[PDB]
């Protein structure tokens, strides 16, 4: 599950890039990861 936002720009639209914060995992199997990444709209769906 990805929590994403319309990318940062000043209006004049009508996005497609998302600031996506999601809970992920690390090399250590117990502890986990909280990271953000920017994705094109075609690789995801709500």
């Amino acid at each position: 599950t990805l929590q994403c936002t319309n990318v940062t720009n000043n209006i004049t639209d009508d996005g497609e890039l998302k600031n996506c914060s999601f809970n992920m995992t690390t090399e250590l199997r117990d502890k986990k990861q909280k990271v953000y990444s920017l994705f094109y709209r075609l690789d995801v769906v709500q």
Partner: antibody, heavy 135, light 110 residues
């Protein structure tokens, strides 16, 4: 271990900077308070800061006179006390209240790369640095 | 604006007593974050209650907490001399600031 420092006996109209130097935990991902207490009085709350330092909430008794700031790298909180008056005669504590260590589904979720969260309270509370504004 | 507490309580040893903290719906009545602090002379406060019902590890079972409406209460059963001190409640507010009670001076009676 918190080192609440920076206080002193000053004048009304002066200015001062406090320091809550933090050890024993990761200050860089933990939101803190300043908390003052006039001698023999209740805990007059001062100011909250975010775990990195963008949010700077304040009580309006201190705002924007006693401005909270921090350095995540130094592991040290600060209270930029500007335009001092007699109500700043107080004992300035250092308090953590927000947050939870995100132990969910039986596993420690953490935010950015296994930091420490706020823990709903403190492992060790504020000692209180004393600003004493007399005339 | 401070959360309102009774200036003082008092009790004979063994007596149970109660302290009230009355806020608004934007702090005490709006959240479960009410916590309670005990303070001795010349010392820094220690939290005896959090999330309004909860005791931090190491605290006596004589300390309980509760909330009804905009008024949260700390209750001490079986007062012992060492309970004497000042008691402050802290609450979280809608703007995510913190606010303290006006304080209560509790006297276990010699």
């Amino acid at each position: 271990r918190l080192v609440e420092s920076g206080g002193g006996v000053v004048q009304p109209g002066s200015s001062l900077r406090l320091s809550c130097a933090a050890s024993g935990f990761d200050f860089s991902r933990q939101g803190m308070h300043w908390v003052r207490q006039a001698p023999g009085q209740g805990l007059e709350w001062v100011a909250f800061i975010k775990y990195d330092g963008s949010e700077k909430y304040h009580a309006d008794s201190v705002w924007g006179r006693l401005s909270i700031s921090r350095d995540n790298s130094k592991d040290t909180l600060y209270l930029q006390m500007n335009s001092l008056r007699v109500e700043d005669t107080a004992t300035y504590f250092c308090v953590r209240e927000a947050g939870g260590p995100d132990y969910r589904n039986g596993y420690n979720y953490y935010d950015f790369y296994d930091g420490y969260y706020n823990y709903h309270y403190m492992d060790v509370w504020g000692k209180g640095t004393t600003v004493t504004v007399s005339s | 604006s401070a959360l309102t507490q009774p200036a003082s309580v008092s009790g004979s040893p063994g007596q149970s007593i109660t302290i009230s903290c009355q806020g608004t719906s934007n702090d005490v009545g709006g959240y479960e974050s009410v916590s309670w602090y005990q303070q001795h002379p010349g010392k820094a406060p220690k939290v005896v209650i959090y999330d309004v019902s909860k005791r931090p590890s190491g605290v006596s079972n004589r300390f309980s907490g509760s909330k009804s409406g905009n008024t949260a209460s700390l209750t001490i059963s079986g007062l012992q001399a060492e309970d004497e001190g000042d008691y402050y409640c802290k609450s979280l507010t809608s703007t995510r600031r913190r606010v303290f009670g006006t304080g209560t001076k509790l006297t276990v009676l010699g």
